[PDB]
Structures are given as C-alpha cells and as structure tokens.
Ligand binder design. Structure first.
Ligand code: 3NY
Ligand code: CA
Ligand code: CA
Ligand code: CA
Ligand code: CA
Length: 63
C-alpha cells in the first residue's frame, strides 16, 4: 500500500492527482479511457478536494 501510493504519487506531494492516475493507468495498459480514469479518481476522492490522499487510496484498494 505505502509503496504503491509512492509509485503513483509521481511528484511525491502526498497526493495522487487525476493527471498522475491517468499516467499510472496508461503505464499499466488498463482498458480505460482518460475520462473513465477521471471518474475512477473522482469516486476515490472521498472528501472531493481533487486529490486522492493515502486514506482514500487504502479505502480504494479495499474494494
Ligand atoms: O486513485 N485512484 O482512484 C485509484 C483507483 C484504482 C487504482 N488501482 N490502482 N491504483 C489505483 C488508484
Ligand atoms: Ca502527487
Ligand atoms: Ca468524490
Ligand atoms: Ca480528508
Ligand atoms: Ca481527497
């Protein structure tokens, strides 16, 4: 979890941004358009501030 968050947190600012997540999904070859990743990010973003923080990320991985 910790290690995975750091991978996706490209700029190391303690958040996964939507753009960072789009880079992650593109690097993994996930069958999702950019728009669908934006929706995935938005759903993961519990507090709605535009960033996926570590707590929201762990709650994601619990799915
Ligand atoms: O932040 N995310 O919305 C999110 C969602 C699914 C993921 N799978 N692997 N990393 C992920 C990140
Ligand atoms: Ca970041
Ligand atoms: Ca949200
Ligand atoms: Ca919060
Ligand atoms: Ca958030």
């Amino acid at each position: 979890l910790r290690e995975q968050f750091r991978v996706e947190d490209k700029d190391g600012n303690g958040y996964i941004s939507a753009a960072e997540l789009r880079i992650v999904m593109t690097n993994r070859g996930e069958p999702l358009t950019d728009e669908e990743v934006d929706e995935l990010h938005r759903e993961t973003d519990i507090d709605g501030d535009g960033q996926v923080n570590y707590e929201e990320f762990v709650q994601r991985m619990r799915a």
